[PDB]
Amino acid sequence: QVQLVESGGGSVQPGGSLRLSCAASASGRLSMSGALGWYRQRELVATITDRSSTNYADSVKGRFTISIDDAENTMYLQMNSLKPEDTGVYYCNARWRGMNVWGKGTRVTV
Amino acid sequence: NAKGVCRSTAKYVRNNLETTAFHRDDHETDMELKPANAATRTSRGWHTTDLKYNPSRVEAFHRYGTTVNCIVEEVDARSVYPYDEFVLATGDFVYMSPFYGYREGSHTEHTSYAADRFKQVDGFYARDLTTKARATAPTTRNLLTTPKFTVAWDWVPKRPSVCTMTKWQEVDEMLRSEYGGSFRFSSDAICTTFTTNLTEYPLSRVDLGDCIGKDARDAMDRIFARRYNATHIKVGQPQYYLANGGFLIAYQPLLSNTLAELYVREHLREQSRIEFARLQFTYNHIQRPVNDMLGRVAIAWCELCNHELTLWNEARKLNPNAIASVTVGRRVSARMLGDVMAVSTCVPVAADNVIVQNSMRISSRPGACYSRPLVS
Amino acid sequence: TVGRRVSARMLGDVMAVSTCVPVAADNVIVQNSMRISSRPGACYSRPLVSFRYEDQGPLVEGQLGENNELRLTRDAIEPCTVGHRRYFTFGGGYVYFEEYAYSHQLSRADITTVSTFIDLNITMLEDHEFVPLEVYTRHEIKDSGLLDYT
Amino acid sequence: AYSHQLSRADITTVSTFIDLNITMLEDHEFVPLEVYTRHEIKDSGLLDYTEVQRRVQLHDLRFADIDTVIHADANAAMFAGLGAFFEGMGDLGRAVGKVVMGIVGGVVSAVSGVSSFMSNPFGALAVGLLVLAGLAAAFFAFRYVMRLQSN
Amino acid sequence: EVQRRVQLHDLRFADIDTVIHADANAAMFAGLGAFFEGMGDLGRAVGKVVMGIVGGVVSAVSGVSSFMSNPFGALAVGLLVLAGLAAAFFAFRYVMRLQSN
Ligand SMILES: *[C@@H]1O[C@H](CO)[C@@H](O[C@@H]2O[C@H](CO)[C@@H](O)[C@H](O)[C@H]2NC(C)=O)[C@H](O)[C@H]1NC(C)=O
Ligand SMILES: *[C@@H]1O[C@H](CO)[C@@H](O[C@@H]2O[C@H](CO)[C@@H](O)[C@H](O)[C@H]2NC(C)=O)[C@H](O)[C@H]1NC(C)=O
Ligand SMILES: *[C@@H]1O[C@H](CO)[C@@H](O[C@@H]2O[C@H](CO)[C@@H](O)[C@H](O)[C@H]2NC(C)=O)[C@H](O)[C@H]1NC(C)=O
Ligand SMILES: *[C@@H]1O[C@H](CO)[C@@H](O[C@@H]2O[C@H](CO)[C@@H](O)[C@H](O)[C@H]2NC(C)=O)[C@H](O)[C@H]1NC(C)=O
Ligand SMILES: *[C@@H]1O[C@H](CO)[C@@H](O[C@@H]2O[C@H](CO)[C@@H](O)[C@H](O)[C@H]2NC(C)=O)[C@H](O)[C@H]1NC(C)=O
């Protein structure tokens, strides 16, 4: 079974920035996933719907940027110029051709 | 949808920059979609041109600076519970719920793609590409853009829920044995051995509709009446066990009439000093012979299963189409994708629609000949 | 026949046999790709692995085989194809490889087991190939799974 | 090499489809030394179905390499290099490229015409005669010059 | 019969492989090796030197064949041969026209 180790969650002030991340066990290679990303509470925030294709919610365009590291088998969600409306629980998720996995949601406050 | 044509021009990316191609380097023109000759009865398709199937394809591509071929193709798609994804007949997944849409009961469904890549058209009227005519009734059509192709399907409200489990197998003979603090079930009808904890599952508090309970009780009574009515006795009420691998086993313990007598006479000797469920394993001198008798039966079935499974598993590596066809009970195409098998339904063709060519010789190269005859 | 894993080889009309040595599943590591950098036209046919006989021991390079066997050769090679997809048995589950690259690892319970010798109520599709574009231009060979006797 | 002939009773028969009490060893190959130098192929008994399909996939790989060696024309490699050179110069490069490609095309067709003619025994003989005639003419002329230089 | 044909194909490949890799230079080097083995230690000192001389000959010949394969190289040698032949013929004719007078 695949397991996601979510980290980087916390609290900041308006106009601040953060960097969330989700490292995965060797049983699931993130760079080969059909879809990856974060969902607010569910509603999409940022994802990589194909190995080279990215998506974002309309209120997030230009603020956040998703990326991936195949060496460390981990994905990152850099998020800048945060607002009080961006607060809530963020759940990372990854899925490979029908196999699906959810990380334990992490809170973000502003 | 409006006419049955494509623009004969396309945007492509090379050198990390967008560029516009044109069919045969001409101006933007509405090219007609024509049916593909290889199109099956069901998996229909259309193209603007046929250059790929004809010989001298490389020269045909080099005869023009740029070429553009618009394809339209109708394929089967499947989605399974919870319906968060669906797979196309091409083997490609789509990480969106097929029930997704702007409708009140659907915008809550799962999706991995941004709203920019999805459009839901209401009051849509289809137009068949073979018979140029509008459909008689409107539908809601979902439209999604992947980085390779655009895909569309008719939207429908989510179907009503169904029972969580389906009857997989009815088994006339199943031996249960306690070992290593776990039950082990085995049979000749199924080569798998089911393992489980000694605790019975409290099905009554989850099958509130009695959907599984009804099916189990009915099947057991049908089998008992058919095969055991005059040879055995049922010990008590059916028992439910959750087996490793994700199966629910409804079990009904039996005693043969000849064995029941031993419990009866032993009970009479005890009374001189009826509920079989209380007595079943209390008499060691009765049970010791039975553990050895039935243990040998269980072992015999294991030996037969290992022997048969070995032959069957080697045969499928040689001819999976034949083995899959007899297993499934209908003709199917099959292919080994390493250590598992992929399958598909073959399409039938009537015998009078087939013609055989008069020769297997090849004119283009004198030393070679076809090894199996040509047909049309 | 013997009731334990054994290696066997036909020496003409008789069979030579020997005991295989077991290796714990956590001591085995699968490599991320089946490509060969030294020769672009070829690719391994079965995935590469790296393992240890004992937890603290030296690391040993090999190649996977059928039914959890480990080979010490790294010699099963194919001409590289397009549209490649494979599932290889890997310690009570499977490793899925796509276009000669490792993707993920499934549990054996994730795939529908076909009933013993006869099965019904099975769902299927009229599979449509959707061949890669390179098969027409560059005229590269399309993946066709493992070879049948025919 | 033929060694000896055994009776069928000299080998332990595997008693049935399932049996026990068999004795075995953890076989250790002890490779003959020559394998490491002369690349001698080590015996592997008769071919299993897996070894047959493994060798079949190795042969179509050997064919792809031989096929590529025959069809990897040095002229095509040069044309590819020239194509990339002229494409990088823009439209000014295209105007020249279209012309010089035809000039190089005329050179390669002349060279292949000569090598084709050279395959014929009469062609091979003709050039040999001309080379000898030219060499002899030059040597006799050089001898004449040497005889004049002294007086 | 399938395994009989597979074993015949890897034999055909071994024969083709040897035909490609059995270089005439290796046959010459083996012939020189066999000569110095019989001469002994007094010959090894000479062997090491002549091996470098032959090594220089084969590298020059392979350099020429590598150049000859190129269209510009094939054209260049063709032009020089024709120029030399024409010069020799015109010079021979000039001498012939003077020898008599
Ligand atoms: C199952 O077994 C019982 C006996 O254990 C059968 O009972 C008979 O039922 C009929 C109809 O009510 C009576 O006329 C007979 O007198 C019963 N026999 C005895 C010995 O009591 C029953 O018929 C069997 N059921 C089936 C479907 O075969
Ligand atoms: C059978 O009994 C075992 C305990 O002996 C159960 O194992 C536990 O399962 C849960 C849920 O997966 C885990 O959180 C625990 O860590 C397990 N405990 C141990 C000691 O392994 C098992 O779930 C039971 N199965 C059934 C169907 O009753
Ligand atoms: C076989 O089944 C019997 C039950 O029919 C088991 O006997 C029970 O064991 C528990 C644990 O010691 C006692 O609390 C009960 O009083 C016993 N019941 C009776 C009616 O004697 C027995 O343990 C099982 N066999 C094995 C191998 O454990
Ligand atoms: C799927 O399973 C059902 C049973 O749950 C099968 O239904 C039977 O089908 C035959 C043929 O039409 C009927 O004569 C029976 O009356 C049906 N049984 C019941 C209880 O209704 C069905 O055939 C299976 N389908 C496939 C394609 O395998
Ligand atoms: C060789 O044969 C003997 C019987 O002649 C086997 O001995 C039995 O082994 C099992 C497993 O340990 C015990 O439960 C029995 O009590 C043994 N029987 C007797 C009579 O002692 C032995 O297992 C066989 N060995 C092999 C390696 O196959």
Residue numbers in the entry:
A (entry chain f): 1 to 41, 47 to 115
B (entry chain C): 202 to 474, 501 to 603
C (entry chain A): 554 to 703
D (entry chain B): 654 to 804
E (entry chain C): 704 to 804
Give the authors' words.
Samples were prepared with and without preincubation of gB with Nb1_gbHSV. We resolved the prefusion structure of stabilized gB at an overall resolution of 2.74 Å whereas the nanobody-bound structure reached 3 Å. Compared with the overall resolution of the nanobody-bound structure (3 Å) the local resolution at the nanobody binding site was in the range of 2.3–2.8 Å. The nanobody interacts with three different domains simultaneously. The interaction features a total of 23 hydrogen bonds and eight salt bridges distributed over separate interaction surfaces on domain IV (DIV) and DI of the adjacent protomer, resulting in 1,260 Å2 of buried surface area on gB. Furthermore, R102 of Nb1_gbHSV reaches into the gap between DIV and DI, forming hydrogen bonds with DI and DIII of the same protomer. DI and DIV are located close to each other in the prefusion state, but are at separate ends in the postfusion conformation, which indicates that the bound epitope, and therefore Nb1_gbHSV, is prefusion-specific. When mapped onto the postfusion structure while remaining bound to its main interaction surface on DI, extensive steric clashes are detected between Nb1_gbHSV, DV and DI of the adjacent protomer. In this assay, Nb1_gbHSV bound the prefusion form with a dissociation constant (KD) of approximately 14 pM, whereas no affinity was detectable for postfusion gB. The topology of the conformational epitope indicates that binding of the nanobody prevents the conformational change to the postfusion form necessary for membrane fusion, which in turn would explain the neutralizing activity.
